[PDB]
Design a protein around this ligand. Structure first.
Ligand SMILES: [Mg+2]
Lengths: 4, 172
């Protein structure tokens, strides 16, 4: 989620 | 990621569809941009990436007043959650958001459990007033659509979409  | 219809809040009351930012963005592309956007506070910060993530299953989060945003299951929106009884801001993914939940809305574009709570810096971020806590009415499937997102220089890793507070992303 944070990575994307 | 969120659908192309989503309105990103630009300074001075302006806005733009996230699909209009890099018009003709190739599916599954990383796109360098230089754009001022509103952060979680109405302050201008830098967006320097426009991501076209391609076709994903999407879902529409609609509130009881009819505010709505459509995005992927792993899209994080800022909600107002009861942790101990202390109301606090947590990112819920769209797939884990459900009715009765409260979405945090940035009023610059348009506080449950707080009075029962009363630690002033607490009810000052919340009662900041540039916010608004909307009860969720539904989260319904919305087929498969093209989705987009941004990379921001902000310190909270957030930007505004349709009044909702969305989370920064590093890739498509
Ligand atoms: Mg859901």
């Amino acid at each position: 989620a944070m990575r994307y | 990621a969120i659908t192309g219809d989503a309105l990103v809040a630009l300074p001075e009351g302006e806005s733009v569809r996230i699909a209009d930012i890099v018009p003709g963005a190739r599916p599954n592309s990383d796109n360098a941009i230089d754009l001022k956007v509103l952060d979680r506070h109405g302050n201008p910060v830098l967006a320097d990436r426009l991501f076209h993530s391609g076709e994903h299953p999407v879902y529409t989060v609609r509130t009881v007043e009819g505010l709505r945003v459509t995005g992927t299951a792993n899209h994080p929106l800022l909600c107002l959650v009861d942790v101990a009884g202390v109301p606090t801001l947590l990112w819920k993914l769209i797939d884990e958001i459900k009715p009765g939940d409260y979405a945090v809305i940035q009023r610059s574009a348009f506080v449950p459990g707080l009075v029962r709570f009363l630690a002033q810096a607490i009810a000052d971020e919340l009662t900041d007033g540039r916010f608004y806590y909307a009860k969720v009415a539904s989260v319904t499937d919305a087929g498969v659509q093209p989705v987009y997102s941004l990379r921001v220089d902000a310190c909270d890793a957030a930007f505004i979409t349709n009044g909702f507070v969305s989370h920064n992303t590093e890739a498509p």
